[PDB]
Design a protein around this ligand. Structure first.
Ligand SMILES: Nc1ncnc2c1ncn2[C@@H]1O[C@H](COP(=O)(O)OP(=O)(O)OP(=O)(O)OC(=O)CC[C@@H](N)C(=O)O)[C@@H](O)[C@@H]1O
Ligand SMILES: [Mg+2]
Lengths: 269, 15, 17, 15
């Protein structure tokens, strides 16, 4: 169809993986999903694309790691006592290292180099930063590398989510497609549990904005949508699709109808 | 809870 | 390693025994 | 047993 017609001209891609995709049951890494996504990204990078990956899920992985360590270091007497909460910043600082080590190992198995770029909120207001980041990203992509962006949570003092960061980077680096990998198959007219909700294949701002009732479950579908609209009307089309399927990325890149599209040229389609 | 813990194992204190 | 696994699974009572 | 109830699991690992 005319909707998925820009896919053949796609050259630079920004892919975001949520917490519901990176970390599965028990707070541990979801090895199957992450491996499939990494294999798809390596195939894409070998086929001539510039892939940018914006990861997440460091908080949960670090929280699980610190809970084990706390259990190991504790005392039977204390195990009895309700154990206190763990600091969120400490959990993020622990989990980022493990997540990046896993990413490096998986991409080394496939012979792909990765780079870790950590940017906070205060950095995006400097005049020079928005210029130097573009040059660094371009230099990395020219050399066939996959930058792995995230929000440095250990340092940051705190709307901005990981999805807003993804939209921001899509705008700045002039990407040509933005894919949001989440748990649900895509944006629905209502909560996915209800049987009266159907998968929308095109988000027209003057038709679905008022007819969509968001539920709940860093940000639900009330913030993914905001970031998607922001990125799309800045000029970068947006695709939302489930991260469970491994082959959704390639099917999107082949022009097949997958997920919901945020495109500015949806006024007349 | 005491007897429970005395019976449980470290891994069991997990989850 | 095997020792670690054994501890991780041993019941406090067994550590007693 | 008092030692065993006040020990930390790691401690059990070290003789
Ligand atoms: N109308 C609807 N249609 C479809 N689905 C809907 C709808 N209404 C509700 N839902 C449900 O909405 C949920 C959204 O999922 P969600 O909120 O869990 O988003 P998700 O991507 O998984 O996590 P995140 O990226 O936001 O977390 C981070 O950014 C971490 C940042 C970083 N510092 C780190 O700590 O790593 C879906 O699941 C459910 O269908
Ligand atoms: Mg969110």
């Amino acid at each position: 169809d005319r909707s998925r017609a820009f896919a053949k001209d796609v050259k630079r891609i920004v892919v975001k993986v949520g917490t519901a995709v990176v970390t599965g049951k028990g707070g541990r890494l979801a090895l199957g999903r992450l491996g499939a996504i990494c294999e798809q990204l390596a195939e894409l990078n070998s086929d001539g694309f510039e892939v940018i990956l914006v990861s997440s899920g460091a908080v949960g992985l670090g929280r699980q790691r610190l809970r084990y360590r706390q259990l190991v270091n504790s005392s039977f007497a204390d195990l009895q006592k309700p154990q206190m909460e763990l600091d969120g910043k400490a959990c993020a600082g622990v989990g980022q290292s493990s997540l990046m080590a896993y990413y490096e190992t998986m991409f080394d198995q496939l012979d792909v180099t990765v780079a870790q770029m950590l940017v906070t909120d205060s950095s995006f207001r400097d005049k020079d930063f928005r210029k130097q980041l573009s040059e660094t990203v371009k230099a990395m992509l020219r050399m066939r590398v996959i930058p792995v962006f995230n929000e440095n949570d250990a340092i940051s003092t705190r709307f901005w989510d990981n999805d807003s960061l993804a939209a921001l980077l899509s705008l700045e680096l002039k990407a040509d497609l933005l894919i949001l990998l989440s748990d649900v198959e895509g944006l629905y007219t209502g909560p996915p549990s209800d049987s009266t909700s159907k998968l929308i294949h095109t988000f027209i701002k003057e038709k679905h904005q008022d007819e969509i009732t968001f539920g709940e479950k860093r940000g639900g579908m009330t913030a993914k949508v905001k970031a998607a609209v922001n990125a799309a009307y800045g000029g970068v089309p947006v695709i939302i699709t489930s991260g469970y399927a491994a082959e959704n990325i390639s099917k999107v890149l082949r022009g097949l109808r997958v997920g919901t599209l945020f495109h500015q040229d949806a006024h007349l389609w």
